[PDB]
Amino acid sequence: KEYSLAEEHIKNLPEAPEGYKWVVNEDYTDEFNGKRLNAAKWHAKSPYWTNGRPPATFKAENVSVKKGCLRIINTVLSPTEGLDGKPGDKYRLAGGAVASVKNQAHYGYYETRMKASLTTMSSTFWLSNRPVMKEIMKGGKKIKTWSSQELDIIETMGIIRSVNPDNPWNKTWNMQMNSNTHYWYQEQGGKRTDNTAKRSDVVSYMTDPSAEDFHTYGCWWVDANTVKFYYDGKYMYTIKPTTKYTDTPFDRPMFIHIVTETYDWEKQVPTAEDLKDKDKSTTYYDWVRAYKLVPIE
Ligand SMILES: [Ca+2]
């Protein structure tokens, strides 16, 4: 009965193209309705992003499954830490970073029912992959280059504090469908460039306060050029990821990341008191559900 709720949820997906049908992808699907995180399917501590963005990192102990939800709680980290669990002054907050074990999630549909923590740390649901090396020539010099991709289905935080009055871009960030795509590109000796694309065919960015209730945040990753975002089952907008470096920028599969983090643009990170209420300091995921398109007959 581990996949029944997800099968039933096909009702709510966008209509499959003619000739095709939505099919549960078991590998990235979880109702979290058991007594623990399924260690066959998930890494409680992501092996991919090992040290968080200071001053928060990620601990396995901050990830649990209880009463129908994946719970990623934000806590004071004590003692303070440097890199890789060592003592140091880099980290004083602990969040969670969950990664699917398998990393072959490609074209298809991905969605979570999430309630954000009432906290200035992120509640997120996204996919990513690792960098792949490609050799290039300039004249007559070989240059190593690397690329990877990253698909952000939702980023929010429950509380907004650092609002520049002159540029209040993040004023309503807890009420906007913040989704995104990144084609990461780097040449050896050069800087890592974050290559982004504008939203197209827009219906809405408008969303409900992320910490007040559970909402549905979903992506139809249609093909290598096209990703479409859904809030509470309604189409929001499209992003065509940038073709700067390749005609087919999203032609590589990904793993799922489920992450609780701290951002440099919100320096009023949770204090001890901010995090004293455990319910409030927790991001809740009722489920994660993934689908594949398959020909009907
Ligand atoms: Ca559940």
Identify the CATH class: Mainly Beta
**What overall geometry do the principal axes of the alpha carbons give?**
globular
Number of strands: 20
Task: Kindly state the percentage of residues in helix.
Answer: under 10%
N- to C-terminal separation?
25 Å
β-strand amount: 35-45%
The total number of structural domains is 1
Give the biggest sheet: 9 strands, antiparallel
Family: Belongs to the glycosyl hydrolase 16 family.
Keywords: Glycosidase, Hydrolase, Signal
GO molecular function, one term: beta-agarase activity
Organism: Phocaeicola plebeius (strain DSM 17135 / JCM 12973 / CCUG 54634 / M2)
Describe the overall structure.
The chain has a single domain (1-297), classed as Jelly Rolls (Sandwich). Strand 11 (132-137) and strand 12 form a beta hairpin. It has one helix at 4-8; strands at residues 20-24, 42-43, 56-58, 63-66, 69-73, 75-81, 91-95, 97-100, 108-115, 123-128, 132-137, 142-156, 180-187, 193-195, 199-200, 215-223, 226-231, 234-239, 255-259, 282-295. The strands form three sheets. Strands 1, 4, 5, 9, 15, 16, 17, 18 and 20 form a nine-stranded antiparallel β-sheet that branches. The protein is mostly beta strands. The longest helix has 5 residues, at 4-8. It is built from one helix and 20 strands. Bound molecules: calcium ion. Residues 31-33, 68-69, 286-287 line the site of calcium ion. The site of calcium ion has 7 residues, from strand 20. Belongs to the glycosyl hydrolase 16 family. It comes from Phocaeicola plebeius (strain DSM 17135 / JCM 12973 / CCUG 54634 / M2). Substrate binds at residues 49, 53, 150, 155, 261.
